[PDB]
């Protein structure tokens, strides 16, 4: 500071260490087809939210089953992205009119597709002066059989119902209908002119490939994977129908490798061929591969049905992360929400599959159905185990996001000590929770920043270099007992 | 790496040793005549599999 | 300084060393045909930028596929140069008129070709006094099917849309339309007379060989390679369609050899003949040659398609440079974004191709598709490996650009010590990062400047001579294990 006139001065100084906070690790992302809903990614925390916002899947998709398996197994949070074969602007619309026939508002469905042709909007008048009520109804089945869509009890009870009571036409009020109808899973309203609508009912009229899974990337609209790559909470991605669309596995693995902060879960085909000839599709350290398919009860036929196991496995990942940590291998855990498997694998066949990076789901007598295998598809010996990759992702993202205060700071010993202290505190916390291995701190990790890592050419060019060394913990895959008679 | 705009950079380094794993050593191969079956080689882990 | 009147004097002195900074090494340049866009080179950092500024490629070009493969593999920055068979001044134009019929502005497409005939400009009036709105729309398909080009929702949704709201006709304001419409990928505006335009819609009317790839070289216009040779960021050049235009390979190699600071990537023909008769086209140290072609998914037919591998390989170059350095051979790396190869090459055929300078892309069981070979087309034994050439390019350009302070300085011991110190610091930094080889500094490099390099005839004629010796590191191509039973 500068002191030019007499007085009292109070100044604040920076302290000797700054805390780092860990990031989320149990959020998932799903892609696939639905019947209703928007095409921008939305967060879901429960299965009833999913049914309310999106509905069911068509016969060519198995998204509903995967989300159900995710939440039955202890998952916490999903990001849903809806993929649609229709143009984004193929949306049903409508108009509201005033006393003498002026269009005052414009109503639009909340997503593209033919479903918007089955939405009815009903306007009625309220008992209080200058107020009216609005109702929105949606039927999932045939419209030809709906007898009284306007009455208090239609012939088939509607699938979705929404009512808004205290509405007004004053734009500066808090009960203006544009502001109240904004939280609605069915429609959108836009204001045009001054007036209040007349009573009655009205319907909305005039309504996949690899490039749809890739998504749209425009200045104000993102769908598909382009929409996911602008969300920083997602830590694992899955596409249940990845084997019906050629060229999607590589796109998913490339997305995860280019972001550098997420993991890919892959499932085998329904018919992968002979056992002696199976291989993994990719050779990435950012993916894992599971086998075989599973059996579930179908809620529209009440019969068994064969589905891929991806969502159940993502739910197992989330559960293990919540109750043990990211350093725990998500294997030797039970699958909930299924009836049986496609095949039963023996111990002789897994001796051929396990050294190849293929993870198996097996069933033991007296113990149930469990995941038996925790490897990645990688050939590098340094990234053979899955929990090591997940721990490094967690650590690296925490460091990246929690150190932006240090840019443009003086390149001298105070900043060096501060940075060293922060990183040491974070790594000691990780060590205390069982993630690092060693009976002392010197065995588990080290951090270096000073004149041993930086030279003078570095200081003259603006570079601050920190070197960190760590020792992760690995699972026990073979438990061996050697018993003898001696001593 | 190259540094052209200001910010934070995180980089991974290769470690000082890489593990080697032993290979299988107790699998056999047999050739001869049968009454049924395909002519591509198939893996068998039990005698009932063979008869089937 | 001179001291003629009494007082206090403060003078600044030059210090004992000046820092050198390394240059960029992962930017690429591409040439080929597009449907829209300008013909001057433009920088692109993302694939959505490319689709927004340029669009798709015609059926006689494969630029879109190469740029997609570049960005799917970890590339950072492209310079795009559009080659066109039409005259540079064959551009669609238009006119804006005032209240009583005076032409006040002139509108012109942003590039030559017939596409400009499908651009519509719409002027409307704003709710604020002395203000108006402008909209620009572009459709990629048929115009005969566009029903309501002026309405809020045309029959086919337009391919490109741009809106500008707060415009004025005051030339000294910051919302003058000439200044606001300057950032537009479709049109250009030029001011003629005083006035404000009337509302309505208007369309723009009255709209390859080796010499087009060479480009125009005029005082105020550069296209093709003439445009690229005025950009100093490019470090590697590729032309995907180099085998359809005879005489382009030699032009590219000559461009790279005459600039002396860039590298050329070449791909084989689709039918190169029998294996025992293959040769490289040139014998330059500034080029590399890759083989065979690859398979991709085509986003307009959803089928497989065979393309040259050039852009994917340039993306691999950029990725390796970002994560390892310029001294690392860009081989034993995975190709992302493809489906399969044209042929599978065995180990017996590569024993014939590798000693000839031809690099192969192979597929290993359990490991995937990888580049297996890191040589140049050169016959000189000193420039056999690719990373050595790239390291020398980097070093020489850094030295050239970071030493212009030394021209016209006194030719005496102070300048000599200063120059020696700077170059030694730069080379020691290069050595510490693994680029040079040796357990000590004396093994890795030396720098000399003094009375051992300069004589008196040199000083009398204005020559300052510096001698530098360096030892680069080379890859391990054959890993040999000799095992015995002794001891």
Automatic annotation (TrEMBL), chain B:
It comes from the Archaea. Transmembrane segments: none annotated. Belongs to the myoviridae tail sheath protein family. This is Phage tail sheath protein FI. The chain holds residues 2 to 53 of 574 of the full protein.
């Amino acid at each position: 500071s500068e002191y030019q006139s007499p007085g009292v001065y109070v100044e604040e100084v920076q302290s000797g260490s700054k805390s780092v906070e860990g990031v989320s690790t149990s959020t998932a992302g799903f892609l696939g087809q639905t019947e209703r809903g928007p095409v921008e990614p939305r967060l879901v925390t429960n299965y009833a939210d999913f049914e309310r916002l999106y509905g069911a899947s068509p016969k060519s998709s198995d998204l509903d089953a995967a989300v159900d398996g995710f939440f039955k197994n202890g998952g916490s949070r999903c990001f849903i992205g809806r993929v649609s074969g229709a143009d984004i602007d193929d949306v049903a619309t409508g108009i509201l009119a005033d006393d003498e026939g002026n269009e005052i508002a414009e109503v639009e469905a909340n997503g593209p597709g033919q479903w918007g042709e089955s939405v009815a909007v009903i306007v009625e008048d309220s008992q209080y002066p200058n107020q009216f009520d609005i109702t929105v109804r949606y039927w999932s089945g045939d419209l030809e059989a709906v007898s009284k869509p306007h009455g208090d009890r239609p012939d088939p009870s509607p699938d979705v119902e929404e009512v808004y009571d205290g509405l007004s036409a004053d734009p500066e009020a808090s009960n203006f209908y544009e502001k109240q109808l904004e939280s609605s899973v069915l429609v959108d309203i836009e204001y045009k002119d001054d007036g209040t609508p007349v009573d009655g009912l009205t319907w909305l009229h005039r309504d996949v490939t690899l490039k749809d899974y890739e998504g749209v990337n425009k200045p104000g609209l993102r769908t598909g994977l382009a929409g996911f790559k602008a969300i920083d909470e997602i830590s694992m991605v899955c596409a249940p129908d990845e084997n019906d669309i050629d060229g999607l596995t590589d796109s998913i693995v490339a997305h995860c490798e280019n972001m550098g902060d997420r993991f890919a879960i892959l499932q085998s085909p329904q018919n992968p061929g002979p056992v002696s000839e199976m291989e993994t599709p990719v050779d990435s350290s950012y993916a894992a591969y599971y086998y075989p398919w599973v059996n579930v009860l179908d809620p529209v036929t009440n019969r068994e049905k064969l589905v891929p196991p991806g969502g159940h496995i993502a739910g197992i990942y989330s559960r293990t992360d919540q109750e043990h940590g990211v350093h725990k291998a998500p294997a030797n855990e039970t699958l909930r929400g299924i009836v049986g498997l496609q095949h039963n694998i023996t111990k002789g066949e897994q001796d051929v599959l396990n050294p190849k990076g293929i993870n198996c789901i097996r069933s033991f007598q007296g113990r149930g159905i469990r995941v038996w295998g925790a490897r990645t598809t990688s050939s590098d010996p340094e990234w053979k185990y899955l929990n090591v990759r997940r721990l490094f992702l967690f650590i690296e993202q925490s460091i990246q996001e929690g150190t932006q205060w240090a840019v443009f700071e003086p390149n001298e010993q105070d900043t060096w000590g501060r940075i060293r202290q922060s990183v040491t505190n974070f790594l000691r916390t990780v060590w205390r929770n069982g993630g690092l291995q060693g009976q002392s701190e010197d065995d588990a990790f080290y951090v270096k920043c000073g004149e041993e890592t930086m030279s003078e050419d570095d200081i003259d060019n603006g570079r601050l270099i920190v070197e960190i060394g760590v020792a992760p913990v690995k699972p026990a895959e073979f438990v061996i007992f050697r018993i003898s008679q001696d001593t």
